[PDB]
Design an enzyme around this catalytic site. Sequence first.
Site, PDB file in Angstrom:
ATOM      1  N   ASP C  10       0.895  -1.264   0.142  1.00  0.00           N
ATOM      2  CA  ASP C  10       0.034  -0.110  -0.082  1.00  0.00           C
ATOM      3  C   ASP C  10       0.794   1.501   0.056  1.00  0.00           C
ATOM      4  OD1 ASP C  10      -2.262   1.463  -0.033  1.00  0.00           O
ATOM      5  OD2 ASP C  10      -3.154   0.927   1.871  1.00  0.00           O
ATOM      6  N   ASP C  12      -0.366   5.306   0.814  1.00  0.00           N
ATOM      7  CA  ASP C  12      -0.589   6.242   1.946  1.00  0.00           C
ATOM      8  C   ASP C  12      -1.103   5.589   3.130  1.00  0.00           C
ATOM      9  OD1 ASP C  12      -1.204   8.680   3.071  1.00  0.00           O
ATOM     10  OD2 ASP C  12      -3.046   9.007   1.958  1.00  0.00           O
TER      11      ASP C  12
HETATM   12 NA    NA Z   1      -3.256   2.888   3.363  1.00  0.00          NA
END
Ligand code: NA
Lengths: 260, 260, 260, 260
Positions: C10, C12
């Site tokens: 992932d 952010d």
């Molecule tokens: Na995230």
Amino acid sequence: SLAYKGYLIDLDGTIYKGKSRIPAGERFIERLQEKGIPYMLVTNNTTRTPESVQEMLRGFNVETPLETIYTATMATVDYMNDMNRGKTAYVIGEEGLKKAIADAGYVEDTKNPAYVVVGLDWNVTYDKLATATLAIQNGALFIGTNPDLNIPTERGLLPGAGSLNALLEAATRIKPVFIGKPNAIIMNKALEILNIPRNQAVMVGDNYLTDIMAGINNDIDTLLVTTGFTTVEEVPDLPIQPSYVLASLDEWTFNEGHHH
Amino acid sequence: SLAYKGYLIDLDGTIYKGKSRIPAGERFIERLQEKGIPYMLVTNNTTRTPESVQEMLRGFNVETPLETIYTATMATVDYMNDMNRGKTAYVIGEEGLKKAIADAGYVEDTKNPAYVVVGLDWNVTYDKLATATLAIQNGALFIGTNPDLNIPTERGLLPGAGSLNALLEAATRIKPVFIGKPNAIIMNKALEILNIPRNQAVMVGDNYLTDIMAGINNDIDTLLVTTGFTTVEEVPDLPIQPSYVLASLDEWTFNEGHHH
Amino acid sequence: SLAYKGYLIDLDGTIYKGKSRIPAGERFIERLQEKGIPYMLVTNNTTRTPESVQEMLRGFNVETPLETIYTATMATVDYMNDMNRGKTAYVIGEEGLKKAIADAGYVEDTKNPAYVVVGLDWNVTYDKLATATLAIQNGALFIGTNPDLNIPTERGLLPGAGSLNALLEAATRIKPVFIGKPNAIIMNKALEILNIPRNQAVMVGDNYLTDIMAGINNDIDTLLVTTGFTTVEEVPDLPIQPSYVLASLDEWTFNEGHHH
Amino acid sequence: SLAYKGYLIDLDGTIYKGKSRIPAGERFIERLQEKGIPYMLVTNNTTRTPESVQEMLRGFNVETPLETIYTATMATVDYMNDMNRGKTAYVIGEEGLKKAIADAGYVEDTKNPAYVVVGLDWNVTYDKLATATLAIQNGALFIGTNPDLNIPTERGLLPGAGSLNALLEAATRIKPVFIGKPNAIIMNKALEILNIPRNQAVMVGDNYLTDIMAGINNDIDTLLVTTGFTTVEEVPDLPIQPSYVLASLDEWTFNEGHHH
Ligand code: NA
Ligand code: NA
Ligand code: NA
Ligand code: NA
């Protein structure tokens, strides 16, 4: 500044707690009686006759007239009688519920009953569930006695009537008409017997999802007492606060009222 | 204009229908075999060993290698082995599923099992459901073998594995990881054994919600044959059309392909 | 005792946090690169081109090849191309998503489009929602780019793509095919580009419901790092623990592996 | 064999149909009036004042006292006044609803309002939805005026108030208190104004999910007339039959009664 004129009151968790006392609950009923204020004792439990509830309450120093007790079994029978779809039913539940339904004149029909009625059955089986599924598919009016997803026991939080109903809703795509708190039918019927206007009544209980939502969803003021299912710690995060939150029913004066 | 290079194929409703033949289904497998095209037979049924499926198919003139058969039981065991949470389980289901899980080294733990696994149990009871509820509440990884809400029987459309799972989801607020069609796990694992790229494969079946949604949700082309669960009349109102709709597998040439 | 051979990661909350650094996230990518271990950066965000993501990451001391970046927009376009239903669409979303879809050859059809595609639109309106509703009712293949119910902003946790999809599901009774994490389509496609077997891969992220459920639901091991959405305090009450929980990616050695 | 003593009656689809007459609906009201039988006109519509409804009905040859008209807007205001949570609100809806709420003394508070109230807004925007989301998250009592998922228009079946509420429920995890049919609050309040016992009343309408379920869920007998939303063809497959099904209100004699 008129005080509330009638009370709707939960039992387990509020007036007593399992086999244990809640002495302030006993005194709450004592005080109602001394003041001559009408009340109903409103429970989702489907396993006891009102006679049995009345006798049990004597052990907790509560002597209440039989007519003050209103259970999800009574309201279920009342609803079946009102809807007048026919004197046949297939029932999943304990003997108390089954006997009440049979006493009301409903005869067992496992295939084409007018009603399928589902409460907690401690000995539910696949075959009972299959029978109810087919009967619902065939057009029976599907009623759940009470929506509680769990039932507290010494073992832990076991599946309640609402979870058994959930299986049948999944299997049939039919949502049951749920009678018990927080739904309207038991509340309307208890209010009718109470014979006090809704805006002069208060619902008193320990369980946010059944008792307090009963008041929010049906527009009746609410008293949450934190002696039972809903803990003191859970109160700040309730999405909708009750009208009153009390640690003990001894804090209630009976001078409280609506918009008062 | 390359033809599909591998097939994923439902059984009941597609290759045979209960105790009855679907002769064009038998010829579909015959033709795959003559052409040397790889295939898997992918079923949500949890009651038979792959040996048993293989023997049963012989009665319908289908001789298929054992390794072509992939059931929700196999995929459930495979997933449990992969997730590696521990060799304990509490299982609701038929003997076929229970034996497969025990054969894989999972020992029964009714209190603190690593896994709770729930398939269809023709003799499910309140106590089995209560046991699973507590075990899930206590932290077990909750797996449903297959999501089918109903199972067709001579009696009618009875509750399926998905409905039993629905009761436990209601009672625990935990959604199971569903292994069977149309979910990814059984599809990924069948594709792995097939050893053909997803965009060169087609999923063939009779049941829109399990077989055809298996392809839509997992991005695999789909052949709906209307010999089973999804009727000819239901086809126009499907929200998403299959890649192909056939009245008989005899209409398939094996020259069909992706974007071809 | 083989170490993981590829990573899905992932952005952010994991490699950076809004406008702020997560220096250990930068070092995680640095270390992957030094060790020559393949990885993909997998995000549900639909507002940036992969070029834009790549440039943004340079500001956080991350230089990554363009082909390592895989967004829900890319996977949505890829799925539309695969399903091959026709080069027309009606899109709700930001310009990034709309441009990607138009660049892929899909022309706007507000009435009979092959696809209705719904992502976050910061300026959604009743009329856009009504247009999509009718188009879905008329038979378009309804796709939601990502299921996230909320999006964090400086204002607070606002409605996300999943909430906009929820309105249309209510209005149409059609559930969208959700592309983004934790659903299979984006995971399968990222794995394909990674070109490492599923059982040799690990999904790394900060968000239990999107990243960690992506691994649980799709059978890929999981590393939760508690620098983002899922807090340290929430970890004990997760229904299914990740394969690993780390306070900082600096704790990871790259010697970790499956069943190893 | 006592005839029903009071009537609760839907408007659009029952007494008139959009811009078109239902002449037998006009005669139904005429006959009620000639017989001196009390009635209420009960509608989920939130866009008209009762004065406006009254004037509109004159064009269809219906002259009804203002006090016979009870809308979801009135019931929403009444509920807000009863619950007494404070004279602030954030409202999503049309001007009719907003004006009624402001006229009742509720001032706009976009941040910490006592109530968030959501009806159909033909010009809803992301920002209105974000504002409501935050206000609900911050603790406002979330009310939906009516649960209808769709609204019929010349364009087709567009999203209704219930679909807008669905977005906010998804974004907040808070279910609104729905006021309108088939929910209890509007029914209780209309019954109160009617001042006839529930078991002496009948609910009359064209829409199974709002009018007829209003009676089933609240224990009031039901008359379905097939001039509106629920078609003649749909009647056989209704899960619970109404008390009566009529092709025209001209078939009703007013001699019909409960258990009679
Ligand atoms: Na995230
Ligand atoms: Na209680
Ligand atoms: Na099948
Ligand atoms: Na109507």
